[PDB]
């Protein structure tokens, strides 16, 4: 769908993968049996990827889009596929609900 929603602190998160291996990030969500668009939200981090390695990623990283591909209602299947061939560089837009001031 359409990208951009709120300002938030993060919004546009980008980090050079190829770090310890991947992004070692555990997402939580899907798409179906609802509005055909489930809100993507990180449940945790593999604690072994640029994500948990960038000391920023963790449970609470709603990705509105990934590599241009909207994630604001994607399925772990597709989302994962997108996050798969991310390359040594991952450029996705994440947002929070409210924390750290």
From Swiss-Prot:
PTM Phosphoserine: list the residues.
88
- Subcellular location, record wording: Cell junction, Adherens junction
Q: Where is the PDZ domain?
A: 12-98
Query: Disease linkage in the record?
Result: A chromosomal aberration involving AFDN is associated with acute leukemias. Translocation t(6;11)(q27;q23) with KMT2A/MLL1. The result is a rogue activator protein.
Q: What does this protein do?
A: Belongs to an adhesion system, probably together with the E-cadherin-catenin system, which plays a role in the organization of homotypic, interneuronal and heterotypic cell-cell adherens junctions (AJs). Nectin- and actin-filament-binding protein that connects nectin to the actin cytoskeleton. May play a key role in the organization of epithelial structures of the embryonic ectoderm. Essential for the organization of adherens junctions.
SUBUNIT field:
Homodimer. Interacts with F-actin, nectin and NECTIN3. Essential for the association of nectin and E-cadherin. Isoform 1/s-afadin does not interact with F-actin. Interacts with ZO-1 and occludin, but probably in an indirect manner. Interacts with RIT1 and RIT2. Interacts with NRXN1 and BCR. Interacts with ADAM10; the interaction locks ADAM10 at adherens junctions following ADAM10 recruitment to adherens junctions by TSPAN33.
Q: What is known of its domains?
A: The PDZ/DHR domain interacts with the C-terminus of nectin and the Pro-rich C-terminal domain interacts with F-actin.
Protein known as: Afadin
Organism, scientific name: Homo sapiens
What gene makes this protein? AFDN
């Amino acid at each position: 769908g359409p990208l951009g929603s709120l300002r938030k602190e993060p919004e546009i998160i980008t980090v050079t993968l190829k770090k310890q291996n991947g992004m070692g990030l555990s997402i939580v969500a899907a798409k179906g049996a609802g509005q055909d668009k489930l809100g993507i939200y990180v449940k945790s981090v593999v604690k072994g990827g640029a994500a948990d390695v960038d000391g920023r990623l963790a449970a609470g990283d709603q990705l509105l889009s990934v590599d241009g591909r909207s994630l604001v209602g994607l399925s772990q299947e597709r989302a994962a596929e997108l996050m798969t061939r991310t390359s040594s560089v991952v450029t996705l837009e994440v947002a929070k609900q409210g924390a750290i001031y």
